[PDB]
RNA sequence: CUAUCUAGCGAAACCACAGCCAAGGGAACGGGCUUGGCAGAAUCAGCGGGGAAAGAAGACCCUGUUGAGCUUGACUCUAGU
RNA sequence: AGAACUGGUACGGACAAGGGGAAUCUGACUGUCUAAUUAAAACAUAGCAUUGCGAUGGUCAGAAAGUGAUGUUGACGCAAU
RNA sequence: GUGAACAGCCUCUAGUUGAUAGAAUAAUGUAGAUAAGGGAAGUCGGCAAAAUAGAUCCGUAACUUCGGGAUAAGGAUUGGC
RNA sequence: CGUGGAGGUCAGUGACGAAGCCUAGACCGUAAGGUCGGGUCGAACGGCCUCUAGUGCAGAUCUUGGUGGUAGUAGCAAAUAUUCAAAUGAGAACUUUGAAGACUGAAGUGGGGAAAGGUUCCACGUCAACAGCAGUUGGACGUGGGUUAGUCGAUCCUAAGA
RNA sequence: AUAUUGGCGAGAGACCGAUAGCGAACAAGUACAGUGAUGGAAAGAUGAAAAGAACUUUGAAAAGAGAGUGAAAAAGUACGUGAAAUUGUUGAAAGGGAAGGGCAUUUGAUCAGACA
């Protein structure tokens, strides 16, 4: 049987967790995760995947360093003590 | 020794047990009220086959 | 009440079966307390829990 | 499995300590709309796919 | 609480409700309606001979595809059913009104039940698996039951 | 062991409206029309005539200025050599 | 292995456990395949025969390459039938 | 233990005694069985089922690539003391 | 005729009750539709002159949501089999203990492990939902506890290969 | 001078008004599915204020009935109003193998205007 049968040895993967996106995406026989190749150096990201995008990209996490920017543009990148 | 149990510590930050007890039935209550309306919304659309083969031909 | 659990300790206390062991149903009162596998040996030693013995097969005719 | 890896029991770990109901002092607060925990897991239902 | 259509003096009667009960329906509204008029007392003496299988319950609406009976001839009706789980919830609600009919200070010996109904509840649902790889509802009926009992006058 | 009766639990397909016949005519084989025969609540088990019963049934013919798989000394090209 | 004796002629006492034979068509055989309608006389098979190739090569690959399979090879071999 | 045997059947240690139940015993079914005399007359067709079956002894043809055929066929016996 | 919005206007209606909803209660119009009374309800809404449009549904094997007859029906029938007394409990065909009968019958219904699962392990409390009957029970609900390595494994080596 | 559906900050609309408008008005790229690429929802409103039902009583308990809070529980966390399909009780009426509909009138109910 080509099914319920065939369904029962379903029981070694080919997926496992990724350092770059925590995601069950890298493969293991050729170590290369499906979201975002991991030892390459650029992620993947095709402009078909328009809604892949939005899942992924700047706003989705934490922007520890990033949101400040514009604070600290507003003031001028300054520096030193505030005042009295 | 023994000075802390989990009772006590939600006695500590308010409810009593009352309290525990009828609002965790409430809470019983929602999940069923909302696993209701997931098997009610489901089953026309759960057994639209893709690939079904109709293992009837003489 | 509900022994299932000291009659299990009683089994692995005395090195035998779930089955061949024996508690006293005059005695659920006082076993239902025995959480602990100290309180079932002196319970195997007072008698209020028993080994039963052998169901036994026999080789007289063979 | 019984030989694991720490990367995967960190996760079994995370999924352990999500896996309570919500704390009743949640529903006492003034402009809530909490009313139950709708992220809840359990092995029964629906595996965590690690 | 507001009830149904009962034509009485509310100080002469004396209710009761049961909400979200995991009855059937379709078998409730027989037990219910096999009492409608009567008095307490006989109907708690029925309610139980029901149990004990002896003067059986009438089915009038839902009645399709059961079977026949004997206890059905002092009805007129030959189909007939003894179903313990509507008539224990209806024996409690009776029981409930006949105590707020005492505290209410009314007097039992000439109490009837004026106003009974049963009402469809919310249905409470689960999965069955059928062949072929597909999903069925498999579904419950339950029921809300309101209850008024009133004392007799000319 | 089921079916059957009972306690509990409790779905589905299908559904224009629905459900007694004969003849006529009619989209050329009426549950409904027309003329007649008749016609008395509510129903249980079975049944497999009918409901041109139901269904992600089989093939047969045709049309389309719709396609695809394959072949060739079809037309137009091509990697390679 | 043998002989008496015995029994409602039973006795591999239950279980377990080959139906046999004469002829034809076909494929030699064991083996493989249409997972979920075709296990076959189809496929493979050993065996027979042909063809190409003596390495700056024969067959094949790659987008290309200071690139590759046969090849850790060399006609009693590799490749194609 | 029987027995050639990890077969089948029965038991010891260990484990379980879980699968919605009660009553009644109509038809039609599912699974299992029996059958007078005849014995494939049924049927597309011996499909299904039945018969045979183990062990010991005797005896075993055509044909043959001489290796097989072959458990050929076909007959007898089987316990207990 | 009607609908959603826009500009003007009635110094428009209105918490002494706007809109909406129900009404085999009434009136007007051929009709589209408008108007009134009553009940319910609780905060905004209309008439006239014009503007503007995501503007009027019985259908599309329409979309989404919900609901019915079928129907208390088909049915909950594989895996040899359950029974008695007591205890607990509101309540026991199904929980626990004891007694009995039985089965798996060592290529097991046993004892352990690899993958995989993830705390399902154990205890206390508990039964609204789940366990297609039930349930005082539970792999469920809630709260907690629990995995100890110089010697077992990974770690180290290389294989086909990358 | 020019471009700009992205990013930061702002102002507005003859726009949508929770089956609409971004997929998302809400712990939404969330839950969940799939080996994976990828796919991808549903879900808003008590009330001015929780004052979220003290206490009594029947029940094993949920709950019920009274009581109470409230302007209103015909607002009781399954909560704004609360349609229809579908359903229960009461009341009226009818009913020989359908029901419904058109014209006409009897009978019953109901409305009328009263010319007061
Ligand atoms: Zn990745």
């Not at chain 2, 019983?28 to 919304?41: D, F, G, M, W």
């Not at chain 3, 009162?29 to 602990?36: D, F, G, K, L, T």
């Not at chain 5, 001979?49 to 004997?70: C, E, K, M, Y």
Request: charged letters at 30%; proline letters at 2%; glycine letters at 6%.
């Amino acid at each position: 049987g080509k099914g319920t049968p065939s369904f029962g040895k379903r029981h070694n993967k080919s997926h496992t967790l990724c350092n770059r996106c925590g995601r069950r995406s890298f493969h293991v026989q050729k170590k290369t995760c499906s979201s975002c190749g991991y030892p390459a150096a650029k992620t993947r990201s095709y402009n078909w995947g328009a809604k892949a995008k939005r899942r992924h990209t700047t706003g989705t996490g934490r922007m520890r360093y990033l949101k400040h920017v514009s604070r600290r543009f507003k003031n001028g990148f300054q520096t030193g003590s505030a005042s009295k | 020794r023994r000075t802390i149990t989990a009772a006590d510590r939600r006695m500590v930050s308010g409810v009593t047990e009352k309290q525990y007890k009828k609002g965790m039935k409430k809470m019983q209550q929602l999940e069923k009220n909302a696993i209701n309306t997931q098997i009610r919304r489901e089953i026309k659309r759960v057994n639209f086959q893709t690939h079904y083969r109709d293992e009837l031909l003489q | 009440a509900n022994l299932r659990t000291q009659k299990r300790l009683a089994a692995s206390v005395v090195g035998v079966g779930k089955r061949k062991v024996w508690l006293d149903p005059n005695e659920t009162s006082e076993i239902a307390q025995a959480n602990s596998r100290n309180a079932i040996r002196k319970l195997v030693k007072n008698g209020t829990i028993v080994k039963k013995a052998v169901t036994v097969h026999s080789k007289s005719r063979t | 499995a019984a030989q694991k890896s720490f990367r995967i029991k960190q996760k079994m770990a995370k999924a352990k300590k999500q896996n309570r109901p919500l704390p009743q002092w949640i529903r006492l607060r003034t402009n809530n709309t909490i009313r139950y925990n709708a992220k809840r897991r359990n092995w029964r239902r629906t595996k965590m796919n690690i | 609480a507001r009830y149904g259509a009962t034509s009485t003096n509310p100080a002469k009667s004396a209710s009761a409700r049961g909400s979200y009960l995991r009855v059937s329906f379709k078998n409730t509204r027989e037990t219910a309606q096999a009492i409608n008029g009567w008095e307490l007392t006989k109907a708690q003496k029925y309610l139980e001979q029901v149990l004990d299988h002896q003067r059986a319950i009438p089915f009038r609406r839902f009645n399709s595809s059961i079977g026949r009976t004997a206890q059905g001839k002092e009805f007129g009706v030959t189909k007939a059913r003894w179903p313990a789980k509507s008539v224990k919830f209806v024996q409690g609600l009776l029981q409930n009104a006949a105590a707020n009919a005492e505290a209410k200070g009314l007097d039992a010996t000439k109490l009837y039940v004026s106003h009974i109904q049963v009402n469809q509840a919310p249905k409470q649902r689960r999965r069955t698996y059928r062949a072929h790889g597909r999903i069925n509802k498999y579904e419950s009926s339950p029921s809300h039951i309101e209850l008024v009992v009133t004392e007799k006058e000319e």
